[PDB]
mmCIF file of C-alpha atoms and ligand atoms in Angstrom:
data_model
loop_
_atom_site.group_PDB
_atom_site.id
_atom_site.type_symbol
_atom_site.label_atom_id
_atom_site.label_comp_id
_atom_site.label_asym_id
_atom_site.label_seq_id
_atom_site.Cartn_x
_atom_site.Cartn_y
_atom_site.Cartn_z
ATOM 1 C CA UNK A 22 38.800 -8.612 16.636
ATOM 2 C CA UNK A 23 37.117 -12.052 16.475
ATOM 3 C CA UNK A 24 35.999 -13.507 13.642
ATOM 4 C CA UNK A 25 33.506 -15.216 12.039
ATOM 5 C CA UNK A 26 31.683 -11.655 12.484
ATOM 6 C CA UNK A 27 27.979 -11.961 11.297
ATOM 7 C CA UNK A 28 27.073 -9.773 8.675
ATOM 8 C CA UNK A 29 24.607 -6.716 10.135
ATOM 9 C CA UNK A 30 21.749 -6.286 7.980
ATOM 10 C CA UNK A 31 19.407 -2.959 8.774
ATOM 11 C CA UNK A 32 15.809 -2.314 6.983
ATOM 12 C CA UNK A 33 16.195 0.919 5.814
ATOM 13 C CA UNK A 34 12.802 1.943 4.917
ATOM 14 C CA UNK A 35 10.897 3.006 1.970
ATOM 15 C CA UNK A 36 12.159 4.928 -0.254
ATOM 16 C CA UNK A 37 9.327 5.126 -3.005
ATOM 17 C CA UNK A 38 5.866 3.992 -3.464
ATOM 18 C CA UNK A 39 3.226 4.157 -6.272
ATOM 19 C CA UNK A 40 0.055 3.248 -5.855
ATOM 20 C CA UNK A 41 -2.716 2.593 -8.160
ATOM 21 C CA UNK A 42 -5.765 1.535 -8.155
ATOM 22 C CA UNK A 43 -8.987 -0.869 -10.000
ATOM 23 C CA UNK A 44 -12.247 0.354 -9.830
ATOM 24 C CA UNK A 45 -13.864 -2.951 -10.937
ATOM 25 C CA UNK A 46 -11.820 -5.126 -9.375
ATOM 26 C CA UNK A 47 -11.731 -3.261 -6.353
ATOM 27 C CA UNK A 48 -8.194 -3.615 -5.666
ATOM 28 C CA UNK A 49 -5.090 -1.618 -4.612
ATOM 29 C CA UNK A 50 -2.042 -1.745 -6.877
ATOM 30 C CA UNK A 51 1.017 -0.966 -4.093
ATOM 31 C CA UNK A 52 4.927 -0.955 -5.915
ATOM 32 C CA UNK A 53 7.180 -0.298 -2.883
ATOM 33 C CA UNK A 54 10.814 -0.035 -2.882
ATOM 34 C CA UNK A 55 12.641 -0.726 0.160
ATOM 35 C CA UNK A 56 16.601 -0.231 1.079
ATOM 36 C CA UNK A 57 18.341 -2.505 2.799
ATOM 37 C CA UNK A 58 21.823 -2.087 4.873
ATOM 38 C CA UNK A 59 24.426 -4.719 4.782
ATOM 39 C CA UNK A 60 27.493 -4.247 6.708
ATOM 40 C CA UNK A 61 30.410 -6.672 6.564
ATOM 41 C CA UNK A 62 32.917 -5.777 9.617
ATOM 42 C CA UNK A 63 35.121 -8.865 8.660
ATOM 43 C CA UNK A 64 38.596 -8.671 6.787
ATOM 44 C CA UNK A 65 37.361 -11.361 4.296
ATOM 45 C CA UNK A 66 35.188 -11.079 1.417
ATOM 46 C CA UNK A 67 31.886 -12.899 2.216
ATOM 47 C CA UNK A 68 28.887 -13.558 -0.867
ATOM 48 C CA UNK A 69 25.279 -12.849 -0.207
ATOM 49 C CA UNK A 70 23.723 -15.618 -1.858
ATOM 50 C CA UNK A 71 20.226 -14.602 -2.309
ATOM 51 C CA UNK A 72 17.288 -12.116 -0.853
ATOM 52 C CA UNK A 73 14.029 -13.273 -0.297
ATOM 53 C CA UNK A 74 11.527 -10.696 1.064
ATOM 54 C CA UNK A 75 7.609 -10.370 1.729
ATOM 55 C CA UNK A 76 5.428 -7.614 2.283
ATOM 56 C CA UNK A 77 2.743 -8.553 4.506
ATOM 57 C CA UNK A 78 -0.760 -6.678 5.545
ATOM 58 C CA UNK A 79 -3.608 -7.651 8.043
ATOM 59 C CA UNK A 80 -1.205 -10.928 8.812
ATOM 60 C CA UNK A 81 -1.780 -11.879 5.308
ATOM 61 C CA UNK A 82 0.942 -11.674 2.525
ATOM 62 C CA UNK A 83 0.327 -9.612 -0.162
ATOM 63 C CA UNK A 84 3.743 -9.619 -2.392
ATOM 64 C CA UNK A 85 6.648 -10.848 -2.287
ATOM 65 C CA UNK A 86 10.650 -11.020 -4.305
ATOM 66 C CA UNK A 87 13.555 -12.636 -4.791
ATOM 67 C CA UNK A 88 16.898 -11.513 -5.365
ATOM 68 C CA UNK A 89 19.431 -13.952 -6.362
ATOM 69 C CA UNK A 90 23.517 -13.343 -6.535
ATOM 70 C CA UNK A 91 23.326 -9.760 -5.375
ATOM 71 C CA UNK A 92 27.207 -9.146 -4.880
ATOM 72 C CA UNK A 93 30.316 -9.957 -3.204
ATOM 73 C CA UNK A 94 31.323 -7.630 -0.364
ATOM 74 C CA UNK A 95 34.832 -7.075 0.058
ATOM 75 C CA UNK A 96 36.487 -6.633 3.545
ATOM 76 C CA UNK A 97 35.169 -4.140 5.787
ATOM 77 C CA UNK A 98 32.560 -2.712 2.987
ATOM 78 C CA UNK A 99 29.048 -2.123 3.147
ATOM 79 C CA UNK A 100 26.492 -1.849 0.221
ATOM 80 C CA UNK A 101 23.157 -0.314 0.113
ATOM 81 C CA UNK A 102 20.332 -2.385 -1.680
ATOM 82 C CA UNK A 103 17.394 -1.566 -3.236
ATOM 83 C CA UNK A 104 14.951 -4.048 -3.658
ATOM 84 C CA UNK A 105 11.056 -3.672 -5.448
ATOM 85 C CA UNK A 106 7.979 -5.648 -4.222
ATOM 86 C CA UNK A 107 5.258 -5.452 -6.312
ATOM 87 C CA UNK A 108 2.067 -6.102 -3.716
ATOM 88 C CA UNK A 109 -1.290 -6.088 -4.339
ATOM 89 C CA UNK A 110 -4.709 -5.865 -1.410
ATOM 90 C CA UNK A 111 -7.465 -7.394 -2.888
ATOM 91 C CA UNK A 112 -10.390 -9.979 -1.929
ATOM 92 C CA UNK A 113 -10.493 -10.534 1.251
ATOM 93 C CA UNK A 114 -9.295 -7.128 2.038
ATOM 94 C CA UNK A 115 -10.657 -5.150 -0.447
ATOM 95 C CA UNK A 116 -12.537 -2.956 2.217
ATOM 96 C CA UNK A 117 -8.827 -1.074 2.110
ATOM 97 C CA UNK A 118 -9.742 -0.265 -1.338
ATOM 98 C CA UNK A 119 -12.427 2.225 0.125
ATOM 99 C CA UNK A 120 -10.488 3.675 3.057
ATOM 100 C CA UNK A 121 -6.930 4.555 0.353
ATOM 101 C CA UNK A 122 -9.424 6.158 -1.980
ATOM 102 C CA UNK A 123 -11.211 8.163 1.164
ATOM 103 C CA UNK A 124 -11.723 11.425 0.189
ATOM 104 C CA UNK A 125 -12.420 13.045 3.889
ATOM 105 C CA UNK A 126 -8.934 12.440 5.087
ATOM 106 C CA UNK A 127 -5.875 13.683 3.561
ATOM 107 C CA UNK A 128 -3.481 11.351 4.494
ATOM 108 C CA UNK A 129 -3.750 7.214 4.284
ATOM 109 C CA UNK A 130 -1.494 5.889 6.608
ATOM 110 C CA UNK A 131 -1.390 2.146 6.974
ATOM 111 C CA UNK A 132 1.250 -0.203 8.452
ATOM 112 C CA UNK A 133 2.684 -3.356 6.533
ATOM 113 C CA UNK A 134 4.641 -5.787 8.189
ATOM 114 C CA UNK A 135 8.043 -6.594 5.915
ATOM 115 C CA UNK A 136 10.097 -9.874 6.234
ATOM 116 C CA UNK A 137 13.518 -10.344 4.742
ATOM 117 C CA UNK A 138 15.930 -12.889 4.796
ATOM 118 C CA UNK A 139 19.815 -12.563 3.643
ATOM 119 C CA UNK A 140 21.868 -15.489 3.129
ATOM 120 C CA UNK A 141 25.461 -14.808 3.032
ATOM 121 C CA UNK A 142 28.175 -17.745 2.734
ATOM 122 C CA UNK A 143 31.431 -17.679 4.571
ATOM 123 C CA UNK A 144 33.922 -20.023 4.433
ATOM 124 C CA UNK A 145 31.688 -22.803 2.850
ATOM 125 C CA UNK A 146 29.152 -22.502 5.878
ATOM 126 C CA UNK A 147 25.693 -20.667 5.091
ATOM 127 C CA UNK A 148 24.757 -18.035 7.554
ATOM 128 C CA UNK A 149 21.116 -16.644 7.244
ATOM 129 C CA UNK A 150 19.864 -13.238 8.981
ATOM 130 C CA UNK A 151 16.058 -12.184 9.065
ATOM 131 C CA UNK A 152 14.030 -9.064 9.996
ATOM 132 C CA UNK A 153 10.828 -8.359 10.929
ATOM 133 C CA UNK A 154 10.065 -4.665 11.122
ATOM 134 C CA UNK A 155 6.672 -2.835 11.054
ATOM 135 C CA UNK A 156 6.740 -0.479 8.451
ATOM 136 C CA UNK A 157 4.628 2.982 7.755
ATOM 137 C CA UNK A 158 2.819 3.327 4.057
ATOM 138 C CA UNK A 159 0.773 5.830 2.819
ATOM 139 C CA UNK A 160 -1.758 3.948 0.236
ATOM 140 C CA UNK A 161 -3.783 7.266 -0.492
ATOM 141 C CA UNK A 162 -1.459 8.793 -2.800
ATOM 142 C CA UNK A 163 2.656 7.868 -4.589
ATOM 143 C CA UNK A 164 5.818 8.805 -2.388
ATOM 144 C CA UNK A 165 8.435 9.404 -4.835
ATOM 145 C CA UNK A 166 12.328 10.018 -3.962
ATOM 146 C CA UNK A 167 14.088 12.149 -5.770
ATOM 147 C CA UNK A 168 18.078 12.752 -4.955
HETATM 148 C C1 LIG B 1 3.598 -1.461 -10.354
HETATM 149 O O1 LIG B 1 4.122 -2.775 -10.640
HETATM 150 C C2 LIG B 1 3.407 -3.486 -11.662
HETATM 151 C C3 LIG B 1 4.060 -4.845 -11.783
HETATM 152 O O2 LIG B 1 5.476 -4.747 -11.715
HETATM 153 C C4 LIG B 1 3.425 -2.693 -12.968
HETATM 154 O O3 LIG B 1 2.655 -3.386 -13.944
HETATM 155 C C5 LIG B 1 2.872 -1.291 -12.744
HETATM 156 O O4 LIG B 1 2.992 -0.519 -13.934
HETATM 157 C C6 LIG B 1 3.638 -0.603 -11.616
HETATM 158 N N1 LIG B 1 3.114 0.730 -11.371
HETATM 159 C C7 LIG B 1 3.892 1.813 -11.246
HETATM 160 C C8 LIG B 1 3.177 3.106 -11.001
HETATM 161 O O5 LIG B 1 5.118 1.752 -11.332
HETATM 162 C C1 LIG B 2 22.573 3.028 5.735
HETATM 163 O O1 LIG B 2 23.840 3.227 5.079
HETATM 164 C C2 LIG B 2 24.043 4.555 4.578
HETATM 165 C C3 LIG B 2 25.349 4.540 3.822
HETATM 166 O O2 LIG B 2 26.458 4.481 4.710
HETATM 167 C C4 LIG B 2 24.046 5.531 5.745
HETATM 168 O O3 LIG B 2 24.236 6.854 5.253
HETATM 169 C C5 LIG B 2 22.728 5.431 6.502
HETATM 170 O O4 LIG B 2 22.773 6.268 7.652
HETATM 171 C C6 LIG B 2 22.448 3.988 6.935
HETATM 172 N N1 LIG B 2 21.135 3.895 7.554
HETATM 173 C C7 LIG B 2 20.954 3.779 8.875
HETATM 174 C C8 LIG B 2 19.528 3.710 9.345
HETATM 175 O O5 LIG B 2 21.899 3.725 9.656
HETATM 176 C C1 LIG B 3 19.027 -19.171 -1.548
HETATM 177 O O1 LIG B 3 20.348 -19.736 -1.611
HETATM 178 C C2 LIG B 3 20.494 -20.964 -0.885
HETATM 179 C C3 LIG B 3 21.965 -21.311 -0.892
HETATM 180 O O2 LIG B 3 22.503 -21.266 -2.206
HETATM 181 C C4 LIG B 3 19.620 -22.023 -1.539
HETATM 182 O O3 LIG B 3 19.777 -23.264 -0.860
HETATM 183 C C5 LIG B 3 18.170 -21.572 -1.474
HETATM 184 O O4 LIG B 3 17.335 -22.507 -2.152
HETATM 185 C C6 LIG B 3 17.982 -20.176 -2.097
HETATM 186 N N1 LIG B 3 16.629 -19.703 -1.881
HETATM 187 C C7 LIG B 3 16.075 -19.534 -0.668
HETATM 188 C C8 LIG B 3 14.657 -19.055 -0.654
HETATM 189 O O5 LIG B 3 16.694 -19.756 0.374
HETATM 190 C C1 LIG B 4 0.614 8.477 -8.841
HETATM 191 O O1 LIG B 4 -0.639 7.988 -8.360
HETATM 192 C C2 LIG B 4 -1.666 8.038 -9.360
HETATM 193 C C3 LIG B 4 -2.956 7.633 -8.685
HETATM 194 O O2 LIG B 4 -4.024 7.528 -9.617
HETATM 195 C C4 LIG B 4 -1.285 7.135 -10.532
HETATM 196 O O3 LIG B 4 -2.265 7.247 -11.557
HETATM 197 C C5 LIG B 4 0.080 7.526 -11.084
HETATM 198 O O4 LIG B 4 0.485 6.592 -12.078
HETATM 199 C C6 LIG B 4 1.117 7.581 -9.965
HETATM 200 N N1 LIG B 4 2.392 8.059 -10.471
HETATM 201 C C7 LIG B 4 3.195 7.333 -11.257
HETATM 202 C C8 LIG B 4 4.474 7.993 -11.679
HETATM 203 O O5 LIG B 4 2.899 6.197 -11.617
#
């Protein structure tokens, strides 16, 4: 059992979505609420000092949040985390406006590309783990979660 042991962070997925959408400004309104594992296999407490996370679309970033002293996570524990990122598609993308409001499919599946960055401090040294992980989104209609 060696130690310093890194904390394991693990994107979840999303657990809700609501969508909405402008008309005039041709734009999609996307609220999308991930969860986030962090596992701390170490037999000291260790802080996560802040969570910064994007959502990102067509290689273009389209929201984005910040989280700042989440928690302290006692030996051996693990928290879930919910975290909201209000995005938005607009501009020079609104041609997605027309394809989430298509009417001949019945499903709007799109992917978005989510970035997050944990930084835990140990000992008076800063570690910092990031993910990138491709991420499924259906912008045609709300996906709710319910327990
Ligand atoms: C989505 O988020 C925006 C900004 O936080 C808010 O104004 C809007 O009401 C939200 N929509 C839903 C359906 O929660
Ligand atoms: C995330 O943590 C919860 C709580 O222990 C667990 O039930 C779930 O399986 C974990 N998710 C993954 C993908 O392992
Ligand atoms: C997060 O916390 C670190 C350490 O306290 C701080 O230096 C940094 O400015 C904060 N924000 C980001 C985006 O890293
Ligand atoms: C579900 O999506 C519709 C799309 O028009 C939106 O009007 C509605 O606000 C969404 N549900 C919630 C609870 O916001």
């Amino acid at each position: 059992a060696a130690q310093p042991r890194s904390i394991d962070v693990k994107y979840i997925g999303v657990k809700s979505a609501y969508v909405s959408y402008d008309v005039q400004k041709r734009t999609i309104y996307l609220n999308i609420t991930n969860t986030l594992n962090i596992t701390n296999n170490n037999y000291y407490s260790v802080e996560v000092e802040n969570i910064t996370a994007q959502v990102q679309f067509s290689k273009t970033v389209i929201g984005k949040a910040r989280l700042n002293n989440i928690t302290i996570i006692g030996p051996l524990d693990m928290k879930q985390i919910d975290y909201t990122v209000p995005t938005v598609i607009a501009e020079e993308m609104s041609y997605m406006y027309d394809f989430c409001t298509l009417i001949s499919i019945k499903v709007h599946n799109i992917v978005l590309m989510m970035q997050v960055t944990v930084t835990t401090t140990y000992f008076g040294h800063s570690e910092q783990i990031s993910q990138e992980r491709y991420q499924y989104v259906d912008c045609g209609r709300n996906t709710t979660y319910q327990l």
